[PDB]
């Protein structure tokens, strides 16, 4: 149906919007603290810590599979990679403060995205 095709289209426009909004997050995290999944061979008890790890890879690779129906699940993967570390990680470390710094800087990319995808639809 033509119905279909158009919610195809928009789920292709949301995909490129969110692609941009992640390099954007990217960016401020110039460190690659949080690129990759977190190792269970080097932190071999990470998931009796955290249940549900996120990293930027995982998101990209969900991206491109179109697996973001809107912004509010994308911030959501988002959140969890800043509130993962900061329960794992203690506040003196390299890894909380690179959290902080994130969260901080990526805020304000996502205060605009949040109104570029009300705005375009």
Same mark, same amino acid.
């Given at each position: 149906?033509?119905?279909?095709?158009?919610?195809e289209?928009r789920?292709?426009?949301?995909t490129?919007l969110?692609r941009?909004?992640?390099?954007?997050?990217?960016?401020?995290?110039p460190a690659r603290?949080?690129?990759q999944?977190?190792? #269970?061979? %080097?932190?071999?008890d990470?998931l $009796?810590?955290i249940?549900?790890?996120?990293?930027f890879a995982?998101m +990209?690779?969900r991206?491109?599979?179109?697996?973001?129906k809107? #912004?509010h %699940?994308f911030?959501?993967?988002? $959140?969890?990679i800043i509130?993962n570390c900061?329960?794992?990680?203690? +506040?003196?470390?390299?890894f909380?403060r690179?959290?902080?710094r #994130?969260?901080?800087?990526?805020?304000?990319?996502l205060?605009?995205?949040?109104?570029?995808?009300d705005?375009?639809?």
């Amino acid at each position: 149906s033509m119905e279909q095709v158009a919610m195809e289209l928009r789920l292709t426009e949301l995909t490129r919007l969110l692609r941009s909004v992640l390099d954007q997050l990217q960016d401020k995290d110039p460190a690659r603290i949080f690129a990759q999944p977190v190792s #269970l061979k %080097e932190v071999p008890d990470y998931l $009796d810590h955290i249940k549900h790890p996120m990293d930027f890879a995982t998101m +990209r690779k969900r991206l491109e599979a179109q697996g973001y129906k809107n #912004l509010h %699940e994308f911030e959501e993967d988002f $959140d969890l990679i800043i509130d993962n570390c900061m329960k794992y990680n203690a +506040r003196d470390t390299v890894f909380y403060r690179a959290a902080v710094r #994130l969260r901080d800087q990526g805020g304000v990319v996502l205060r605009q995205a949040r109104r570029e995808v009300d705005s375009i639809g």
